[PDB]
Amino acid sequence: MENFQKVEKIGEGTYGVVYKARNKLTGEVVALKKIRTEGVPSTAIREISLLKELNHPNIVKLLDVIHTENKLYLVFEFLHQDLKKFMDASALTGIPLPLIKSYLFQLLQGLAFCHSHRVLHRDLKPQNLLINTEGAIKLADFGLARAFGVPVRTYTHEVVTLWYRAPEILLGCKYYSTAVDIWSLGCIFAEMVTRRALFPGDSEIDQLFRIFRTLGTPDEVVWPGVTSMPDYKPSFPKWARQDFSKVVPPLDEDGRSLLSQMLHYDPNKRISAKAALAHPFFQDVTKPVPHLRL
Ligand SMILES: CC[C@H](CO)Nc1nc(NCc2ccccc2O)c2ncn(C(C)C)c2n1
Known part of the structure; x- marks a missing residue:
């Protein structure tokens, strides 16, 4: 215009x-x-x-x-600024825990709101989490995916990353829920803490297998109905769950507890955004300012 x-x-x-x-x-x-x-x-x-x-x-x-x-x-x-660039600028120091906590809490508020209106994001990632000088963080591209069902390439066919995709999407679930956003946010939380992506898959099967290697191969015990999913294969390799203090050190027990509830395989056991806001991890939550270089 x-x-x-x-x-x-x-x-x-x-x-x-x-x-x-x-x-x-x-x-x-x-x-x-x-x-x-x-x-x-x-x-x-x-x-x-x-x-x-x-x-x-x-x-x-x-x-x-x-x-x-x-x-x-x-x-x-x-x-x-976006969180990806802010993470890259904090690479050597890391983001301070109070600021990680504040950002995580704010996005959960964002999500609780969108989800109470039955709007899903569907493609949460550090590059669509935007930040300002006043300590705010905001969800960007909300609800656009549902407008026209996203493919795996952009306009010059650059690669859409799979790293934050929930396992139910990867296993072919057509009618996935608000829980997919919680999974993504858990992945981002882990990355803020560790300064490394949690599950950096470069194909759908590599993404799935990276999840399985960390969290164990899912079965009917942890995820009822999983073996009936469109892209579930009996032939998946069988990895045991790793101990979870291995995944996001040196995060405290409260943060690890929350993250684990955000990364439950079963979308119906996965914590809701509203419940997560009440988690003990946020008992001492504050709102720091980042020093941003613009
Ligand atoms: C390539 C588009 C993405 C969308 O999340 N980046 C981006 N960065 C934004 N800002 C961050 C930024 C600042 C300076 C240079 C690059 C950059 O991404 C931004 N502000 C509003 N939007 C809308 C479209 C949501 C934005 N989108």
């Missing part, structure tokens, strides 16, 4: 390219996501319009939706 001047390429999501841009009338700086072309499904327009209404302090505000020349621009509030 002629109302915006591009400032710089922010990046390239699954659906299209993101630009930092300035509104010419009001002068606000925004992030513009440009999506491409059949006439744009009317279904997607309806669904994306309902996300305009999903407002919470821990969700990146969708300002406006412009459908033009049968093309789609999503206008978001702009944040100055």
Whole structure:
């Protein structure tokens, strides 16, 4: 739209390219996501319009939706940094536990809200967790996956990462639940603590096998109904569960307890966002400011 001047390429999501841009009338700086072309499904327009209404302090505000020349621009509030870059800048020191705790709590609030409206994120990852100078963190790209069912490649066919995908998605479950977001967030929590991705799979089977190697190969004892899943194979190798203090040292017992509940195989035993907010790990939660370099 002629109302915006591009400032710089922010990046390239699954659906299209993101630009930092300035509104010419009001002068606000925004992030513009440009999506491409059949006439744009009317279904997607309806669904994306309902996300305009999903407002919470821990969700990146969708300002406006412009459908033009049968093309789609999503206008978001702009944040100055994402968690992936903040993790990479904290690589040698690590993020302080109070700030990890604060970010985890805030995202759980975000998720509890979206989930109480039956909106799932579906593709949570450090690059879509955005942070500001005031100690906030926000969920970005919320509900877009459901608009048009995400593939495994982007617009120049860059790779969509599998590292945060819940096992039920990987095993072919079609009707997965809000629990998939909790799994992703657990994966991110572990990565903040250890400064290494928990399950860095480079294919779906490598992603599944990395999960199995750490958490044990799932069976009917831990996950009733698992062997009836579309992509479950009797022939999966049989790995025993590793002791869990091995996975996220030097995280304390409360954090390890929460993480373990976030990473339960069975989506029905996996902790809900609302329950997680009441976990003992957050008894002493605070809201520190990060020093950000912009
Ligand atoms: C490539 C798009 C992703 C979406 O999570 N990055 C990103 N970074 C944002 N900000 C962080 C950032 C700042 C400066 C340079 C790159 C960069 O990603 C951002 N602010 C609003 N949005 C909307 C589209 C959600 C944003 N999206």
